């Protein structure tokens, strides 16, 4: 029941040193990183799950540049910012699976030659 | 606060249709989801059925097949359920609980209705 | 419906011992999403239902550490590190996997005074 400013796709290019893949939240009421729970896939299962109860960051070996930035999860942002090294290798379709406590919305979005 | 207020107390014969407020302060009503939830003696809890306020989607327990219709009102922030053609079966304390897609976090007082001629 | 059953009914317990409350499931109550939605609710005496567990071990907002869910697929356990006298009152659980959402039984915790 959480609601997203949408964005249908987001380009990159080589000149780009690294990449950013938009996920904002308009209306989660949590006041600390403990109630968040954050899920990102692509094509499939989790790249990257960000667990606030714990503060445990995971990430598998071809996507260890993977990150996103806690000190505005509060505010409504889960973006994940990687390199054009595993951006290059895996451009599709990625979802933004964030989780509050007992709700929970998500959203995809779209990840330019010469 | 959170806090979610309801209707009193009803009376009513079998073969007559109550319907039950649930007014919601303390937070944004389309925030969240809300769910009918009834405890009947001498049965379990009853998952009824839910509607999401923004889009006024909803899901219903097909145990109510026909006879249970659960509605919305944003302008007052205020959901409702109507159930109809009552029977000795369905007297038991209505619970509105507000949640997510499949927990409730949140409920209210309570509503008996007692089904008597 | 998925049935659930609990055990027991009712709980003697002293305050500062454990208790165990398990619930299992005809049929499992994983989702396609691969999350299992297992909530487990208290009923205070004279008070409206509040959750305490949400998704089989997340605690809610404002719940004691001592209170940790546990299972899977069928079979589910919640568990306390010690109970108190403010912990009076009969538990649920209830599965979000599968419409129509079901109840337990329930299991009613008395105080060993």
């Known amino acids: 029941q959480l609601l997203f400013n949408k964005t249908k796709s987001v380009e990159f290019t080589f000149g780009n040193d690294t990449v950013v893949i938009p996920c904002f939240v308009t209306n989660m009421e949590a006041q600390n990183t403990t109630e968040v729970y954050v899920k990102w896939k692509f094509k499939g299962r989790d790249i990257y799950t960000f667990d606030g109860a714990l503060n445990k960051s995971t990430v598998p070996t071809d996507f260890s540049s993977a990150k996103i930035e806690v000190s505005q999860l509060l505010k409504g942002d889960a973006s994940l910012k990687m390199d054009k090294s595993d951006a290059v290798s895996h451009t599709g379709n990625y979802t933004c699976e964030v989780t509050e406590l007992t709700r929970e919305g998500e959203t995809i979005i779209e990840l330019r030659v010469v | 606060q959170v806090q979610l207020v309801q209707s009193g107390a009803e009376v009513k014969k079998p073969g007559a249709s109550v319907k039950v407020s649930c007014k919601a302060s303390?937070?944004?009503?389309?925030?969240?989801?809300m769910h009918w939830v009834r405890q009947a003696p001498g049965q379990r809890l009853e998952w009824m059925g839910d509607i999401y306020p923004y889009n006024g989607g909803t899901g219903y327990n097909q145990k109510f097949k026909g006879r249970v219709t659960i509605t919305r009102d944003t302008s007052a922030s205020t959901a409702y359920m109507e159930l109809s053609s009552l029977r000795s079966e369905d007297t038991a304390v209505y619970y509105c609980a507000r949640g997510g897609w499949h927990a409730m976090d949140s409920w209210g007082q309570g509503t008996l209705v007692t089904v008597s001629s | 419906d998925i049935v659930m059953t609990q055990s027991p009914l009712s709980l003697p317990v002293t305050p500062g011992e454990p208790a165990s409350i398990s619930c299992r499931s005809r049929?499992?109550?994983?989702?396609?999403?691969?999350?299992?939605?297992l909530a487990w609710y208290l009923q205070k005496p004279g008070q409206s239902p509040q959750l305490l567990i949400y998704?089989?071990?997340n605690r809610f907002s404002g719940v004691p550490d001592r209170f940790s869910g546990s299972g899977s697929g069928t079979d589910f356990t919640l568990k306390i590190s010690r109970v108190e006298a403010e912990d009076v009152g009969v538990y649920y659980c209830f599965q979000g996997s599968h419409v129509p959402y079901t109840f337990g039984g329930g299991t009613k915790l008395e105080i060993k005074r």
């Open positions: 998704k089989v071990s």
């Open positions: 049929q499992s109550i994983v989702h396609t999403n691969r999350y299992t939605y």
């Open positions: 303390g937070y944004t009503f389309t925030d969240y989801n």
